Amino acid sequence: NLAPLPPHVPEHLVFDFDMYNPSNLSAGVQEAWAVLQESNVPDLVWTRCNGGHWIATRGQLIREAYEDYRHFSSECPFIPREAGEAYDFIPTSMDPPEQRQFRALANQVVGMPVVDKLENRIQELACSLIESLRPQGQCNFTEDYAEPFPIRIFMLLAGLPEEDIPHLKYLTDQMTRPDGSMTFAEAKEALYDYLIPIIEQRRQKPGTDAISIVANGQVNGRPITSDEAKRMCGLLLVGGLDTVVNFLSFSMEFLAKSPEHRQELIERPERIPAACEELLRRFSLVADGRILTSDYEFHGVQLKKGDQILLPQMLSGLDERENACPMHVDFSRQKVSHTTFGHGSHLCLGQHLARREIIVTLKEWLTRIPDFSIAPGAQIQHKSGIVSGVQALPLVWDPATTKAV
Ligand code: HEM
Ligand SMILES: CC1(C)[C@@H]2CC[C@@]1(C)C(=O)C2
Ligand SMILES: [K+]
Secondary structure, X not given: OOOOOOOOOOHHHEOOOOOOOOOOHHHOHHHHXXXXXXXXXXXXXXXXXXXXXXXXXXXXXXXXXXXXXXXXXXXXXXXXXXHHHHOOOOOOOOOOOOOHHHHHHHHHHHOHHHHHHHHHHHHHHHHHHHHHXXXXXXXXXXXXXXXHHHHHHHHHXXXXXXXXXXXXXXXXHHHHOOOOXXXXXXXXXXXXXXXXXXXXXXXXXXXOOHHHHHHOOEEOOEEOOHHHHHHHHHHHHHHHHOOHHHHHHHHHHHHHHOHHHHHHHHHOHHHHHHHHHHHHHHOOOEOEEEEEOOOEEEOOEEEOOOOEEEEOHHHHOOOOOOOOOOOOOOOOOOOOOOOOOOOHHHOOOOHHHHHHHHHHHHHHHHHHOOOOEEOOXXXXXXXXXXXXXXXXXXXXXXXXXXXXX
C-alpha cells in the first residue's frame, strides 16, 4: 500500500521501492536493491512504501548522512516508523555524545580480545559441523551450517542454552524480516521478556558470560542500569543471530556457483582474508537509517524534521562510483570500498568476530569440501529487510571428492 505523498515531496523524486519485498528480488537481493542505482534514478528518492520515507541511493550520500548525526539521528533508525519508534537498543538508538560510553562495554564482550579467546572454539565448531556433513554429499546450508555455526558460538559467549535458539531466532527475525505475525514492538518486548529475569539473576550472581559482563559493567565510570543492560543485550542477541548467519549463505551460494573462484582460494589460501572483504562488499546485506532532527536541505532536496531516511549500508559498495564493475567479484580488487559494517560513530562492534567466523568458514569448508554445487534444479530465493538473507540453500557434492581431516 502507498502512503499519501507529503506536501514537501516533489513527484519527480518518487520511486516506490519496497525494502521488505523489492520488485526485482528474483534476480538476487543485492541486484534488487541495485535498481536504485540505474541511470534514471536520482541520488535521493522518496518511496511511498512502508509508510513513506527517503532513500539515499549512492555511497557519497550514504556516507555523508552517517557522518552527520546532528541532522541524521539514530533515535529512530528503522523503517517503518512504528519499528523505528519502538527501537531502543543500545548503543544503536543513541547519538553521540551519549552513545559513546556504551561502545566500550559492548567491545568487552564481542571485541577483538574476546574473538582471539574464542578462536579455538570457533575453529573446533566449524570443523565439527563440516565434517559431519561431508560424508552426506548434500546439505541445506542455511539450517545445517549458516545458522548453527554463528548462533551456537554466540549462545556459548552469552551463556544461553542452545535449546533457546528456535525461540530467539524467531524473535530476532521478526525485527529484521517480519512475517507479519508480530510488530517490531511485540518482538522486542518478547525478547526483553526473555532477558529480564536472566539479567537480574546475573547481576545477583555474576558469571563470566557476555550477559553477566554487560549487566555488571560500568560506562564512563558509573554502574550500568538494569534497563540499559537489557537494551544492550537485546542488540547483541540480534547481532549474533541475524547477521553472519545470513552473510555466510550469500557467500556460499556464490562459491557454489563459481568453481573458478573456489579454485582460486584452494590454490592460494592466503587470499582468503582478501576474499572475505570482497564478499562483504559484493554481498553486503544491511540497510537501516536515520531520522531528520530538523528541516534540512540535502543535495538539493528539502528534507523535513521527522522525515525518515533509509541509508542502505549495502549500496555503498555496489555503487559504480565507489567500485568499478561493482557486480563482479574479484579477490584481487585493489581498493575494496564499502560500508557493510556501517559508517560513522556506529561502526559495527562485532565485525572482528564476524570476519573470523567468515574466514574460518571459507578455510575449513574449502579444505574438506572443495567441490560442491547448487542442488539440481534448485532456484535460490532471497529475502529482503533490515538485514537480507537466503531462504534456502540446498548444496550437493560427491563424497569421493572430499577430504576428511
Ligand atoms: C556479517 C555480519 C555483520 C554485519 C554486516 C554488521 C553490520 C552492522 C552495521 C551496518 C551496523 C551499523 C548500524 C547503524 O549505524 O545503525 C552495526 C552495528 C553493530 N553491530 Fe554489527 N554487523 C555484523 C555482525 C555483528 C555481530 C556478530 C555482532 C555481535 C553481536 C555485532 C554487533 C554490533 C553492535 C553492538 C553494533 C552497534 C554499534 C553502535 O550502535 O555503536 N554485529 N553492525
Ligand atoms: C542493523 C544491525 C545489522 C545492527 C546490528 C544488528 C542490527 C539489526 C541492529 O539493530 C544494529
Ligand atoms: K526509538
